[PDB]
A paper describes a structure:
Lassa virus (LASV) is an enveloped, ambi-sense, bi-segmented RNA virus endemic throughout Western Africa and is the most lethal of all known Old World arenaviruses. GP is synthesized as an inactive precursor preGPC, which is co-translationally cleaved by signal peptidase into GPC and the stable signal peptide (SSP). Post-translational maturation cleavage of GPC by host protease SKI-1/S1P yields the receptor-binding subunit GP1 and the membrane-spanning fusion subunit GP2. SSP is not only critical by functioning as a trans-acting maturation factor, but also associates with the GP2 subunit, resulting in a tripartite mature GP complex on the viral surface.
To study GP conformation at endosomal pH, we determined the VLP-derived GP structure at pH 5.2 (pH 5, and S1 Fig VLP pH 5). The structure was resolved at 16-Å resolution and revealed conformational differences when compared to the same structure at pH 7.3 (pH 7). These can be attributed to a conformational difference at the membrane-proximal legs and a slight opening up of the spike, creating crevices at the top of the spike between the GP subunits. To localize the GP1 and determine its orientation relative to the LAMP1 binding site, we used volumetric correlation to fit the GP1 crystal structure into our GP reconstruction. Interestingly, the triad of histidines that has been indicated in LAMP1 binding points towards the crevice between GP1 subunits, the putative LAMP1 binding side. The histidines may act as a pH sensor opening up the spike at pH 5 to create a binding site for LAMP1, but further studies are needed to test this hypothesis. Here, the membrane-distal GP1 remained bound to the membrane-anchored GP2 at pH 5.0, possibly providing an analogous shielding function and at the same time creating a binding site for the intra-cellular receptor LAMP1.
Numbering used by the authors: 81 to 237
The structure:
């Protein structure tokens, strides 16, 4: 049985994309995906993935800089419902600076500025309003889920 998303040790927020679907964003020290893969092996999975990230980018109004940087990322599918896990490299100042131009960083920024949970540190990046965010959280988890089920992690596969 899956762990809870809504816990005192987690920071969480739900994005309501559709009329009945959405994304549960969870900052946690709990790993949900146990492999190193993100198999977007078909055009359908490939669009669900882009739809998930665009929804985040639109909603949080993320103007993400081009720094040629990446977060370690796994993803999985459970009957059309995607799970994305970021293995965050934001634990120390250099890491935040080197993983600044990522979607995961934008989420951290949003959590920080919106005060959605957890304490963070913003390092001035090179570009405008964009800050490189430090956090002690090990994982950022994004799951296609409903509001009724958003407080418990869904099963990835
Ligand atoms: C999540 O894990 C980290 C360790 O990876 C916990 O500990 C923090 O780690 C950072 C970086 O090593 C330190 O700067 C902090 O001082 C540590 N804090 C504590 C209390 O140990 C972190 O606390 C964990 N968070 C949760 C909510 O479990
Ligand atoms: C993110 O971290 C988790 C946990 O540290 C990784 O999960 C491990 O993945 C390896 C595959 O190389 C397995 O052999 C281990 O059993 C997994 N451990 C656990 C606790 O699940 C995960 O692969 C990492 N993802 C990325 C993209 O780096
Ligand atoms: C992803 O694909 C690789 C190679 O095709 C395979 O070894 C791996 O098991 C796949 N992962 C998942 C979660 O299906
Ligand atoms: C969640 O999955 C369903 C079915 O795959 C899809 O219709 C819906 O758009 C997805 N939600 C998001 C936010 O991508």
């Amino acid at each position: 049985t899956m762990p809870l998303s809504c816990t005192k040790n987690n920071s969480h927020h739900y994005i309501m994309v559709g009329n009945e679907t959405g994304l549960e964003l969870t900052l946690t020290n709990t790993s949900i995906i146990n492999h190193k893969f993100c198999n977007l092996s078909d055009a359908h999975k490939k669009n669900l993935y882009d739809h998930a990230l665009m929804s985040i980018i639109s909603t949080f109004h993320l103007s993400i800089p081009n720094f040629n940087q990446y977060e370690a990322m796994s993803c999985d599918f459970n009957g059309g419902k995607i799970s994305v896990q970021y293995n965050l490299s934001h634990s120390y100042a250099g890491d935040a600076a080197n993983h600044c131009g990522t979607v995961a960083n934008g989420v951290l920024q949003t959590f920080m500025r919106m005060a959605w949970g957890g304490s963070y540190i913003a390092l001035d990046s090179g570009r405008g309003n964009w800050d490189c965010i430090m956090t002690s959280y090990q994982y950022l988890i994004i799951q296609n889920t409903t509001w009724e089920d958003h407080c418990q992690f869904s099963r990835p596969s």
